[PDB]
Amino acid sequence: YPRKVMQHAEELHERILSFDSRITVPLDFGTTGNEVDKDGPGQLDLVKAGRGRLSGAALAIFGWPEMWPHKPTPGFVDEARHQQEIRYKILTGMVRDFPNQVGIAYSPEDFRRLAMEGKFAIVMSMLNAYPLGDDLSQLDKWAARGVRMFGFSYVGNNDWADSSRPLPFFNDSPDALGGLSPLGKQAVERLNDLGVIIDVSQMSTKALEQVAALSRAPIVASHSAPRALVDIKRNLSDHEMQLIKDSGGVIQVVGFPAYLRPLSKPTLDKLDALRARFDLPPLEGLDYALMPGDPIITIWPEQRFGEYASALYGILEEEPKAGLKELVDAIDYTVKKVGIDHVGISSDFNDGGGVDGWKDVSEIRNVTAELITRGYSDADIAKLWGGNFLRAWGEVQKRA
Ligand SMILES: [Ca+2]
Ligand SMILES: [Ca+2]
Ligand SMILES: [Mg+2]
Incomplete structure (x- = not known):
């Protein structure tokens, strides 16, 4: 970028709030080798955030049927609960150990306050209903502990909601529930009530x-891109x-x-050769290119899945990375469709996200420099970087 544009970006971030609606908490975050207050090996720490001037981020209480492979048994639900509890202890522990540097925001007001105080503002989120079983009151209990956003799904169907990415390793069928189960529908009412x-x-x-x-209240997609860019579920x-x-x-x-960018032909060629040696037909579309999604995979022995999955992900690792151009194309498209007031930004940092240049x-x-270059105003950039999220968050809490 020209220095004039970089300088403009820096001047603006001296002044505006910035918010990333999706960063994963590593289970060893805050341990030796991975401290929160050091320039560490991850995509988030207090040093990197201070340098970039990131005001805050939504960090999710997350668990799922971790295979890394072992197929899920019923005891996997309790493990997924341990993953959630670990992430909770990390987050409250960051505030305990670093009170002048970090806080948790329980409302858009808190977020703005913490930002003014110069403290990184954590928004405690939760993603995936899998760890919760059939207990709706787990929503009330997690809200009471600080959760302010809940996503029903991750990869894999669960008993509350179907996923866009059913996993054949979990013996998933596409659209198994037809959308939400009766308890998932009751979860929507409960979340509205809880704010x-x-x-x-x-x-x-x-x-x-x-x-x-x-829903009687604003809803959010905390980390999504348009199909107009990549036509995947x-x-x-x-x-x-x-x-x-x-x-x-x-x-967001x-x-x-x-x-953001469809897989290049050399990568597709590589995937097709691999698919052929595991008796799968040539790819039609990208859904089964980006993950081991073929339905027949449910009958494979674990060892066979392990080999294929590992090899697939190795090939994906070689795909040249999409850049800031694609990220902002996606922003541009979404804004065309829903208007500047309904768009935000997220990274998927620590779960594979980040583009060339970010x-x-x-x-x-x-x-911000790419946004400036495309002709977004300072006001519009402030809305993208969190203003819109904070408005919607306020409206959600009003409907409690
Ligand atoms: Ca337990
Ligand atoms: Ca300006
Ligand atoms: Mg082999």
Whole structure:
């Protein structure tokens, strides 16, 4: 970028709030080798965030049926609960150990306050209903502990909501529930009552549609990109975007390279050769290119899955990374469709996100530099970097 543009980006971030709606907490975050107050090996720490001037981020209480492979047994639910509890102890522990440097925001007001005080503002989120079992009151209990946003889904179906990415390793069938189960539908009412933002990123299309029909409050997609860029089920159709817009909500466009640029032919060729040696037919579309998604994979021995999955992900690792151009194309598209007031930004840092030119939280102003270059105003950039999210969050809490 010209220095004039870089300088403009820096001047603006001396003044504006910035918010990333999706960063993963590593289970060893805050341990030796991975301290929160050091320039560490991850994509987030207090040093990188201070450098970039990132004001805060949504860090999720997350668990899932971790294979890394072992197929899920019923005891896996309790393990997923241990993963959630670990992440909770990390977050409250950061505030305990670093009180002048970090806080947790329980409202958009707190977020603005913490930002003024110069403390990194954590928004405690939760992603994936899998660890919660059939107990709706787990929503009340997690809200009471600080959770302010809940996404029903990750990879893999669960008993509350179908995923956009059913896993054949979990013996998943696409759209198994037809969207939400009766308890998932009751979860939507409970979340509205609790004043917790409903997050539709990762959820199947039908489940999204049901959340939209059932929610009395703004909904958010905390890390999603448009299908117009990459036509995969994980990405949003124009109609799904309109639903989120119509709730008053926000599409937080994610810097996840493979959701922004379609896989290049050399990578597709590599995947097809691999698919052929495991008796799978040539790819049609990208859904089974980006993950081991073929339905027949459910009958494979674990050892066979392990070999294929490992090899697939190695090939994906070689795909040249999408850059800031693609990330902002996606922003541009989403804004065309829903308007500047309904768009935000997210990284998927620590779960594979980051693009060429934005590799960790210290590099956020690079995103701003590309935005400046395309002709976004300072006001519009402030809305993208968190203003829209904070408005919607306030409206959600008003509907409690
Ligand atoms: Ca236990
Ligand atoms: Ca300016
Ligand atoms: Mg072999």
